[PDB]
RNA sequence: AAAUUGUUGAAAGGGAAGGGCAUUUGAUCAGACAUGGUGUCACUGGGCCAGCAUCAGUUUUGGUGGCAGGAUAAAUCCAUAGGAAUGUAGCUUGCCUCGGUAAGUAUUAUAGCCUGUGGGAAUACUGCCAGCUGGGACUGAGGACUGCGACGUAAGUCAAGGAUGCUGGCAUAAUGGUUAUAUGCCGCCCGUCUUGAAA
RNA sequence: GUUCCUGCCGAAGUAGAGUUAAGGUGCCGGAAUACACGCUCAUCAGA
């Protein structure tokens, strides 16, 4: 149904498993691997907390490899003054 | 400056915002010339008519269901 | 802080109120407004909704649509730019 | 537009009893093949009598520089009418290639003497290959040993509404 | 007769624009109208 | 101290399809133009207008007039780009170019190391 | 870019200097012109005095105020705004005077009058119109002067403290490390 | 009877009454889904609104791919004989701040350069593509089917003779109207004239 | 002297989007106080 599935981790943030529409995202160039958690079960229909301890285990996992990421995905982001979007390099 | 350019489109042209066309009655014969059309049209009950019969009109109008431009014109104001 | 947008001023009109002209704080070129269209214009308690369209002129001011014009009397307004719809 | 310069030919048509005419070359500069071709009939009918009904054209080609890398100096003939009479000029320009110095005389005459293009008429660029014969004054200021001069007009925009610093 | 069933062309203004400043000069002086030969291939595409 | 047009005057291309490469001028077509080449930048041999360009410092030994071999092989021998990358004006522009090419993630690495 | 825009009066043209101040308060911004007295206007004094005598308020900061006004649409409500906006003074009046004031390059005399062009300052003309207060605001100008030098001491030795810290902030690990890996 | 004049009464205001503009504070009025059904407060269908997806028309803006032509670009590069000065490498002479100075031959040497001239090409420009892919903006006109089509083994499906689908909310609201003071700014006898408009 | 409103034919239109001529880009006013040349500031400067 064309709404982007995402996961804080709640762990890390406290953000759970939610749809979110994807024109109302920006997308950062910097990846994990989400080959670790296999995220086939929950669907649509299944939207109208173990399943996202077990989302959240996988993920974790492979955040711990890459350095920093793990405060980076805990903080929010602003824009401050003298920060112009079109040059920003998201 | 008035021209033909601005002229309204034929399909809403004559139309109340109701979506009604206004079509003059003065009695209830005439009124019961608008007994099906209620969709498209709607009375609009003459100036010179009398308080005594302005009531009739409102009943048989309400009893065939169509739509009054002017009620309570002379029985009430504004 | 909690700011996730631009705060942008209204210039004028198109000159027709249907359009209004908006300056972007740090665009100098329209290169640079060509990012900021299609994004959400929101004039401020009541809100008025709207659209950045194209550019305007070669100093980076931009054309923007609202649902209902603008009163005339925000010509210096602060006038907020959001970043949805992202195309990033 | 950006100048080109072109090679034009033509025979201008044979006729009964008459052999194939001789071919009239010429070197135009114009933006594009097709104003070179009209400069071209334009300056034939000075010449001699002629027409384009009358003759036909053989072949345009453009010409590039040959080396457009070296800096050389240019003697440029100039000939056009201040509106009552007409008179001849000659102009040393120093630059890369031909169509460039072309396009700086053309900028240069039209800067000093209310001229257009159409007025304006070209007789012949020729390259010097030895310095010593460059007679101009101005264009013999660059050839000096060393040269050496600060940038002028240093001061650039602001930019900005309001400074601060000054 | 084909070129005749044709309809007259109804060209939009060029896109880029007409080029020179100034278009009621003959080509080769430097304006618009004229014949311009393979040019008009420029112009008509950004006509049309 | 004083920046002169010269033959073996390096220089910096501000605006143009270089977008900022360093050129060296070989020969001084007069006072507004100069013909440049930057064979170890990549630049093509052209003449250009002083105006787009802009002067720098470093100078090195150059015949004038030559060839863009030549050229390459002297500006080998000055090592001028060594050189440039030594001076504080080629830190900055690395500096800018490297503060736009950083990523939110990166940004945000920045302001942690900052606390 | 700040909340309120001290423009000096010093150098500039009331033309170009209130053409850019109308321009900015139609857009919003809050700006307030100090030190009118000294504006220049190009020309001869005489042409300029005639001028303002053909108009005939004789202070040089309503001369300015009419010549913005110029601009500005006054008899539109936006216009008025825009006139509520602007702030006008003859000298730097409190609380200003702590306060660094930008210039426009684009009004200055310097940069826009030719050198050996005939010009003329805003106050000889007021004066010689009848504005009876040059002499009040010159003697406070000087003290503000004086005032000026010993803040520039102060300045100066806050530059070699600013200096000094920077020194100290070099010595450090953590920005050393942070600009190598990244900014 | 109008037109006109005078006394008395009420109100506002200021030397004229007077307007327009802005702000201020208030007072007062209008503001549906009576949503069709089901279930033991929950779900479902219609209509209004907001967003998104996929399309169609119109144009705008990028990025990028392929191909043809030219002097099969010309340069450059590597070659390459001849030639020169803006005359290198040196030697010689005079004088020498004992290291630089001055100019005679010097045609490549402890620099280079220009022509003839061989090879290999690249790039630039022009032109074509019924080549891809991205971001914008305005339009959604039509109301059972019919046509040209495309693909589908086939059946059927579609971007093919004009917009449909998904998600969310859908009201004492969203808001809209009227009226009154106070505060200040501007204007301020009338006609014409004027710009676009007072002036 | 003029001749209710609208439309039509003819010597010698309304609204949205885009493009563009003539023009213009200090502000009122929408557009570079952009570039590049030659000039000129004259007691008739010059719009
Ligand atoms: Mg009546
Ligand atoms: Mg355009
Ligand atoms: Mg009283
Ligand atoms: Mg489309
Ligand atoms: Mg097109
Ligand atoms: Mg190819
Ligand atoms: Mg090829
Ligand atoms: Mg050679
Ligand atoms: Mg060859
Ligand atoms: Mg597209
Ligand atoms: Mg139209």
């Given at each position: 149904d064309n709404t982007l599935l995402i996961s804080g981790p709640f762990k890390v943030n406290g953000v759970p498993l939610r749809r979110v529409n994807a024109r109302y995202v920006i997308a950062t160039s910097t990846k994990v691997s989400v080959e670790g958690v296999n995220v086939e079960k929950f669907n649509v229909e299944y939207f109208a907390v173990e399943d996202q301890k077990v989302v959240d285990k996988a993920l974790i996992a492979e955040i711990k490899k890459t350095p920093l990421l793990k405060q980076y995905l805990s903080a929010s982001f602003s824009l401050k003054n003298g920060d112009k979007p079109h040059m920003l390099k998201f | 400056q008035p021209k033909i350019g601005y002229g309204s489109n034929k399909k809403t042209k004559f139309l109340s915002p109701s979506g009604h066309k206004t079509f003059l009655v003065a009695n209830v014969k005439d009124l019961e010339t608008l007994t099906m059309h209620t969709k498209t049209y709607a009375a609009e009950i003459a100036h010179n008519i009398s308080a005594k019969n302005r009531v009739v009109i409102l009943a048989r109008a309400k009893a065939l269901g169509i739509k009054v431009?002017?009620?309570?014109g002379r029985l009430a104001l504004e | 802080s909690h700011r996730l947008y631009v705060k942008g001023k209204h210039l004028s009109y198109?000159?027709?109120?249907?359009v209004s002209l908006i300056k972007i704080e740090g665009v100098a070129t329209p290169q640079d407004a060509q990012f900021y269209l299609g994004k959400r214009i929101a004039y401020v308690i009541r809100v008025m909704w709207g659209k950045v369209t194209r550019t305007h002129g070669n100093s980076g001011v931009v054309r923007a649509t609202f649902r209902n014009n603008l009163?005339?009397?925000?010509?210096?307004a602060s006038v907020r730019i959001f970043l949805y719809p992202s195309n990033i | 537009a950006h100048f080109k310069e072109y090679q034009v030919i033509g025979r201008r048509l044979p006729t009964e009893s008459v052999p194939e005419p001789k071919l009239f070359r010429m070197r135009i500069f114009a933006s594009n093949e097709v104003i070179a071709k009209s400069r071209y009939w334009y300056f034939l009918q000075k010449l001699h009598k002629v027409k384009k009904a009358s003759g036909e054209i053989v072949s345009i080609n453009q010409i590039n520089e040959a080396h457009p890398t070296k800096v050389k100096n240019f003697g440029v003939w100039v000939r056009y009418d201040s509106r009552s009479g007409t008179h001849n000029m000659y102009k040393e320009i120093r630059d890369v290639s031909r169509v460039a110095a072309v396009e700086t005389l053309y900028q240069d005459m039209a800067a000093r003497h209310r001229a257009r293009f159409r007025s304006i008429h070209i007789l012949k660029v020729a390259e010097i290959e030895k310095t010593a014969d460059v007679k101009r004054q101005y264009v013999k200021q660059f050839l000096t040993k060393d040269l050496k001069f600060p940038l002028p007009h240093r001061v650039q925009k602001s930019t900005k509404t309001f400074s601060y610093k000054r | 007769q084909a070129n005749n069933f044709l309809w007259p062309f109804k060209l939009s203004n060029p896109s880029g624009g007409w080029?020179?400043?100034?278009?009621?000069?003959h080509f080769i002086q430097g304006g618009s109208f004229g014949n311009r030969e393979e040019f008009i291939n420029k112009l008509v595409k950004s006509m049309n | 101290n004083w920046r002169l047009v010269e033959v073996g005057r390096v220089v910096l291309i501000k605006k143009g399809q270089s977008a900022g490469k360093l050129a060296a001028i070989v020969e001084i077509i007069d006072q507004k133009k100069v013909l440049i080449d930057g064979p170890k930048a990549g630049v093509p041999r052209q003449a250009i207008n002083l105006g787009q360009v802009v002067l720098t410092p470093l100078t090195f030994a150059l015949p004038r007039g030559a060839r863009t071999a030549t050229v390459s092989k002297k500006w080998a021998a000055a090592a001028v780009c060594e050189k440039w990358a030594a001076s504080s004006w080629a830190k900055k522009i690395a500096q800018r170019e490297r503060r736009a090419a950083l990523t939110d993630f990166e940004r945000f690495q920045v302001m942690v190391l900052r606390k | 870019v700040e909340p309120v825009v001290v423009i000096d009066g010093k150098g500039h043209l009331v033309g170009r200097l209130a053409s850019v101040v109308a321009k900015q308060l139609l857009n919003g911004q809050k700006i307030v012109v100090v030190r009118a007295e000294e504006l220049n206007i190009s020309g001869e004094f005489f042409r300029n005095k005639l001028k303002y005598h053909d108009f005939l308020f004789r202070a040089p900061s309503r001369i300015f105020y009419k010549a913005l006004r110029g601009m500005v649409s006054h008899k539109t409500a936006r216009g008025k705004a825009a006139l509520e906006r602007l702030k006008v003074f003859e000298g730097i009046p409190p609380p200003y005077d702590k306060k660094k004031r930008v210039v426009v390059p684009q009004a200055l005399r310097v940069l826009r009058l030719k050198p050996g062009r005939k010009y003329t300052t805003l106050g000889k003309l007021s004066t010689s119109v009848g504005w009876k207060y040059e002499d009040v605001v010159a003697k406070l100008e000087a003290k503000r002067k004086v005032s000026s030098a010993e803040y520039y001491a102060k300045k100066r030795a806050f530059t070699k403290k600013v200096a000094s810290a920077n020194a100290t902030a070099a010595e450090s690990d953590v920005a050393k490390q942070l600009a190598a890996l990244g900014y």
């Open positions: - | 431009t002017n009620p309570k | 198109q000159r027709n109120p249907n009163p005339a009397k925000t010509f210096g | - | 080029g020179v400043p100034r278009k009621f000069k | - | -």
